[PDB]
Design a protein around this ligand. Structure first.
Ligand SMILES: [Mg+2]
Ligand SMILES: [Mg+2]
Ligand SMILES: [Mg+2]
Ligand SMILES: [Mg+2]
Ligand SMILES: [Mg+2]
Ligand SMILES: [Mg+2]
Ligand SMILES: [Mg+2]
Ligand SMILES: [Mg+2]
Ligand SMILES: [Mg+2]
Ligand SMILES: [Mg+2]
Ligand SMILES: [Mg+2]
Ligand SMILES: [Mg+2]
Ligand SMILES: [Mg+2]
Ligand SMILES: [Mg+2]
Ligand SMILES: [Mg+2]
Ligand SMILES: [Mg+2]
Ligand SMILES: [Mg+2]
Ligand SMILES: [Mg+2]
Ligand SMILES: [Mg+2]
Ligand SMILES: [Mg+2]
Ligand SMILES: [Mg+2]
Lengths: 60, 78, 141, 150, 129, 259
RNA sequence: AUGGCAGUCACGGGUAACGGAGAAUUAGGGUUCGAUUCCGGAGAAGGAGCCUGAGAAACGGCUACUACAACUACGGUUCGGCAG
RNA sequence: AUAGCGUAUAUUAAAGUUGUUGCAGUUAAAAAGCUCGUAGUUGAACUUCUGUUCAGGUUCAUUUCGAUUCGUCGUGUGAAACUGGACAUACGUUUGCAAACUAAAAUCGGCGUUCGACUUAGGGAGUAAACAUUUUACUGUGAAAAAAUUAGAGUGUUCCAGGCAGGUUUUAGCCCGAAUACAUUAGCAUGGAAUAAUGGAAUAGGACUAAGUCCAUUUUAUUGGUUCUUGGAUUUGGUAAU
RNA sequence: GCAUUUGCCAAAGAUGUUUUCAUUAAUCAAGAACGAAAGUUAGGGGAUCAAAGACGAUCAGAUACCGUCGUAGUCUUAACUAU
RNA sequence: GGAAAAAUAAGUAAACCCUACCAUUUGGAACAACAAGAAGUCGUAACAAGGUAUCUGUAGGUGAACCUGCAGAUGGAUCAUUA
């Protein structure tokens, strides 16, 4: 879409806002183009599993 | 008797090939004596109640026109 | 230009051409000519039948072997069928006149490279999956 | 190059640039219009008349000088050659063929050639009729041709 | 016979840059041929160009820079809603970086891109990159 | 078809009722009344899902059947599970003296506006047809299927009247003409309120209209969908969701979460 | 009175064809399905006829025929039609 | 692969192996032996180009300015093009509105004039209706049911997904929701300058204009008779680079 | 498909054009004109070569490749056949 | 005056029969026929100029492949020889 598309401007932002609530992109990574460079390895790390362990809350 | 057939010429689009083909619908038109007919002229019909099996259109405005021969050959996106 | 015509007004032409030149496809020509309905199963995936007799058939070209086969009579269809009985001892379970469930072998047409005119597989004896009869701990009558 | 999948070239004729009339010549449009219609009266083709005015009386392109195309000049002056050169001639030879064919009812190459020539004539009729430049009921068959012979 | 001289002229030209010709003479020319030309010129593909007055239908001579990679027309000039654009941009153009799909509009003739500005576009004409 | 339909399906019942998709399978089918099927809100919907005074289905059955009379529509008592309360109506909940406007959202959902004993008096009527009937007498008719006897003569067919329910009296009308305020009863643009720009009639069978409003937006709709909410800028009733004006999904965000 | 339709495919035939909303895979374009919750249509064993009513040729109403289902003291009877 | 996994059959993709996009056709399958030819398909080039200036943004550039920060705004130039105006033999005319300024005339004041305020005339601009041959095609909005697809909000224990839910620390009450997009094909409203087709004055006649004459006719209470407005028919004369 | 001379009959390309006409055109289902041989019908004609056939020879076999003869055809008029 | 059975004519028209035709299925045999395979049998066509070449068309003959006449094409065993 055009960079000033009523749609993009709204859905684009909201998609990002969601990448933020789940913390996949850091504050300083707004621009949509970044939505793509997302490792499945990164999205895997934000799981109750990957977290409980990386929170020294488990032995493994 | 005071009834005529008008032929409309339109194009139809073809989703796949992204192009058109020619097509023609024939129409039963009723002609009040008032205007004088002639074959091969453009006519204006209105939507009048069913007058017969086919008829459902009456002539309201007639324009005389010249086509040198075949009315069938004649095909105009009028 | 090439053979095909590139007119914006000539869609019709291209259209009819494709519908026509398309009969040259067997896959098309096949289902289009209700051919599937005329085979022994009448389109069906499987068919029940009665064993008419266990016959054996010889392997082809570089292979030489006695294949196990049962001649079956399909129920509503009522046709003579050539059916290959699978694995090793298999035919030892098929008693003549029992009820059998048959299905095709790799796309209905060419039989396995080895077999001659057989187009079917036998999967059930008296309504008992063969595999089941093939492994002791399963079933037997 | 008309009815010819194989033969084709370039005869000649390229009107010179300068759209005005040649210097050396002096002739009010009218002067020419007389010669033109006079010559025409004698029974000439606008096709042939123009040829004279070029070969004889140094008038390269009557159109450039009058601001009028020959056939037009002629039509304005009643001296209009009824049937156009185009059709006229084609029909002429189209006919000549038929006569020759008769005494040579076996000459096949000529049967063929006529087929092409008669074909053309039907192409002109289609045309000349559509430009309301010839009555719609016009029809070249054998009687249309012999009709002009009388 | 002849048709879409824009195509006649266009390829004659491509054949030029492709052969490495220093300049080209396009024989049958029209307003279209010229507009397209000044659009390529304006975008910087072709160089200076002169129109000779053939008392019949002008002849044009276009100087060849050496940046034209390809410039052709498109068979029947289909109609193209603004919605039909990406289809053609990903289709004709070698990238999302040389956007040059000339179209005809009611708003005249615009670059593949300009048509999005004016917000209309319509029938395809040709392409160059 | 067999005869005349008689039910209604959950799935098929208008999005204006903001209905429960999972709900059941049906939905109270509006009873033939003052307003058309689609343009209406059967009471059961009005109390159960709307007000929420009722709840389960039997809850209604009590309310409208109870010998006390708890529901009033335009100064009258109603006891029909699905009376089609329509646009610009006035509903009173006896036992609490509640007064409501039956008006559409800006997003097209039926909204209940709370009125003061003041507006609860007047109700806005739109003129259906106008012709003279029996023994030389003039009759006017309102969308609300009101039939009027001896009405002021300066009233053209597409008018809008202010009605004093208390006296079943008319007062201050106002036709639709370049320069008025309007509400659109239905369409891809319902719930909007703006200034009429001009009305281009095309007679061929369908006239159109244009409009402006707060943020000066351009609106387009067919006359049949224009309801004159007032004459010359001043609206005549309090509107729901602030002023009758909807926001871009973009304006909603910036107003709420301020993006 | 003699027209009406037709290669811009009439007329006729096939369809394991009730039409849509939609369903499966899809770079784009396509390919194949839609009995089946929404809508519209058709039908209630086949076929025709009708009473009644605001409303159906209804069909969980009636009449006759074709083929059938249930009882019988064989005289006669059935509010006999599960594609709810 | 894993509470799942084989198999049979129809079907999708791989199939640029049915191809409009996007195939092949000397020899691998495939140009007809060859010509004519109505349907069909396809068709050359010309018709305000262009310039000047103003304005609104737009961008981009920046030996640059003011603000903010974790990335934007304002300002200036140049530039392009858009737009929209205007004017230039140059896309319109009437109306009503509004009007913006100017040329005269009036009135009022001071000393016929120096000047000022206030009137008639005047078009832009500013809307709405009537016109620019007729369509194609494109813009845009009206219409395109719901459910489904996309999709916003929303921790149903995640999730399928439902459309709910959020805060009792204002709790006989509070806050917030049920949004949005796509919908091609045919119809409607509408903006339009390109391509494309179609059309206007050539037998002549057309165009604009004045008068004359004849036919037809609305309002004049109505009927006549005149006249007259309004349409149409001609004849003539004038105008126009016919 | 067309090569002896000469004479008629209608035709054709290309070139040459400061001649007219001014889109008249490209290709084409239908639908037609042609299309060596061989072959067919009814007449001509019949020199040479020659399918079938009759013979010699060659071969294990030869009604085949060589040799001696020979009918249809090959030539023609008028029909038909289309590869 | 209303009104049951009965009877009546024109009508809608069930079923049934006859006369034609369509669609969809399904059926049939000895001998025959077709399909596929081979170090069956007889010979050798074709490739090699495969006994001095294949091949196309048409015609005629023959255990068989095929031979033969007339006309072609090289995909040939030639891209070539007036002095
Ligand atoms: Mg055409
Ligand atoms: Mg093998
Ligand atoms: Mg040439
Ligand atoms: Mg009810
Ligand atoms: Mg109406
Ligand atoms: Mg049918
Ligand atoms: Mg279907
Ligand atoms: Mg249903
Ligand atoms: Mg309906
Ligand atoms: Mg059941
Ligand atoms: Mg697998
Ligand atoms: Mg295949
Ligand atoms: Mg002007
Ligand atoms: Mg010689
Ligand atoms: Mg012949
Ligand atoms: Mg003979
Ligand atoms: Mg010997
Ligand atoms: Mg001899
Ligand atoms: Mg063998
Ligand atoms: Mg041979
Ligand atoms: Mg033979």
């Amino acid at each position: 879409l055009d960079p000033k598309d009523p749609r993009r401007l709204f859905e684009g932002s909201a998609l990002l806002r969601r990448m933020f609530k789940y913390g996949l992109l850091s504050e300083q990574e707004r621009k949509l183009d970044y939505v793509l460079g997302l490792t499945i390895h990164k999205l895997m790390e934000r799981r109750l599993q990957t977290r409980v362990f990386k929170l020294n809350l488990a032995n493994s | 008797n005071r009834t005529v057939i008008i032929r409309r010429d339109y194009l139809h689009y073809v989703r796949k090939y992204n192009r058109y083909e020619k097509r023609h619908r024939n129409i039963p038109v009723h002609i009040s004596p008032c205007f004088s007919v002639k074959e091969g002229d453009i006519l204006v019909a209105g939507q009048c109640r069913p007058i017969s099996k086919t008829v459902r259109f009456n002539a309201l405005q007639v324009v005389p026109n010249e086509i040198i021969g075949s009315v069938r050959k004649q095909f105009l996106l009028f | 230009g090439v053979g095909k015509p590139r007119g914006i007004r000539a869609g019709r032409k291209l259209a009819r051409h494709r519908k026509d030149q398309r009969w040259a496809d067997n896959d098309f020509n096949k289902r289009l000519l209700g051919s599937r309905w005329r085979n022994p199963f009448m389109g069906a995936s499987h068919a029940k039948g009665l064993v008419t007799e266990k016959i054996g058939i010889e392997s082809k070209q570089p292979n030489s072997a006695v294949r196990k086969c049962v001649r079956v009579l399909l129920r509503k269809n009522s046709k003579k069928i050539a059916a290959f009985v699978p694995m090793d001892g298999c035919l030892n379970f098929l008693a003549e006149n029992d009820e059998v469930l048959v299905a095709g072998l790799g796309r209905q047409g060419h039989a396995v490279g080895d077999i001659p005119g057989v187009r079917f597989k036998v999967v059930c004896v008296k309504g008992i999956s063969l595999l089941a009869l093939f492994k002791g701990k399963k079933e037997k009558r | 190059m008309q009815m010819k999948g194989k033969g084709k070239g370039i005869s000649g004729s390229a009107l010179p640039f300068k759209r005005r009339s040649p210097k050396w010549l002096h002739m009010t449009p009218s002067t020419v219009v007389d010669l033109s219609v006079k010559l025409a009266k004698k029974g000439l083709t606008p096709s042939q008349i123009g040829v004279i005015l070029r070969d004889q009386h140094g008038i390269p392109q009557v159109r450039f000088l009058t601001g009028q195309k020959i056939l037009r000049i002629l039509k304005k002056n009643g001296c209009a050659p009824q049937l156009p050169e185009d059709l006229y001639f084609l029909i002429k030879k189209a006919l000549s063929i038929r006569k020759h064919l008769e005494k040579n009812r076996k000459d096949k190459d000529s049967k063929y050639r006529l087929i092409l020539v008669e074909s053309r004539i039907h192409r002109l009729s289609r045309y000349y009729k559509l430009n309301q430049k010839l009555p719609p009921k016009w029809k070249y068959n054998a009687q249309t041709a012999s009709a002009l012979v009388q | 016979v002849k048709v879409n001289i824009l195509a006649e002229c266009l390829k004659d030209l491509v054949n030029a840059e492709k052969m490495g010709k220093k300049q080209v003479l396009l024989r049958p020319v029209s307003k279209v041929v010229l507009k397209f030309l000044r659009i390529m010129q304006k975008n910087g593909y072709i160089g200076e160009f002169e129109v000779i007055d053939d008392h019949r239908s002008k002849k044009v001579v276009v100087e060849l820079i050496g940046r034209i990679n390809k410039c052709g027309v498109i068979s029947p000039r289909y109609d193209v809603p603004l919605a039909d654009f990406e289809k053609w941009t990903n289709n004709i153009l070698p990238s999302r970086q040389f956007g040059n799909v000339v179209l005809t509009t009611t708003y005249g003739i615009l670059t593949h891109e300009e048509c999005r500005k004016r917000h209309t576009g319509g029938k395809i004409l040709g392409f160059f990159y | 078809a067999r005869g005349p339909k008689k039910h209604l399906k959950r799935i098929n019942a208008p999005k204006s009722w903001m209905l429960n998709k999972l709900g059941g399978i049906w939905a109270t089918r509006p009873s033939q009344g003052p307003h058309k099927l689609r343009e209406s809100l059967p009471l059961s919907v009005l109390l159960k899902e709307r007000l929420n005074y009722a709840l389960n289905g039997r809850d209604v059955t009590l309310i409208l059947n109870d010998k006390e009379q708890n529901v009033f529509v335009d100064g009258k008592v109603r006891r029909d599970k699905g009376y089609p309360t329509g646009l610009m109506d006035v509903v009173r909940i006896e036992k609490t003296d509640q007064s409501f406007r039956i008006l559409y959202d800006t997003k097209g959902r039926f909204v209940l506006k709370s009125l003061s004993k003041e507006e609860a008096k007047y109700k806005l009527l739109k003129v259906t047809a106008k012709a003279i009937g029996p023994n030389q007498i003039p009759y006017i008719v309102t969308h609300d299927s009101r039939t009027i006897r001896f009405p002021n003569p300066e009233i053209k067919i597409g008018d809008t009247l202010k009605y004093d329910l208390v006296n079943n009296k008319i007062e201050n009308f106002a036709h639709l003409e370049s320069g008025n305020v309007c509400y659109i009863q239905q369409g891809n643009n319902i719930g909007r309120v703006g200034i009429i720009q001009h009305i281009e009639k095309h007679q061929g069978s369908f006239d159109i209209c244009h409009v402006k409003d707060a943020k000066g937006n351009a609106f387009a709709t067919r006359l049949g969908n224009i309801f004159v909410l007032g004459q010359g800028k001043k609206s005549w009733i309090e509107l729901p969701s602030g002023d009758g004006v909807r926001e871009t999904i973009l304006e909603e965000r910036k107003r709420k979460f301020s993006y």
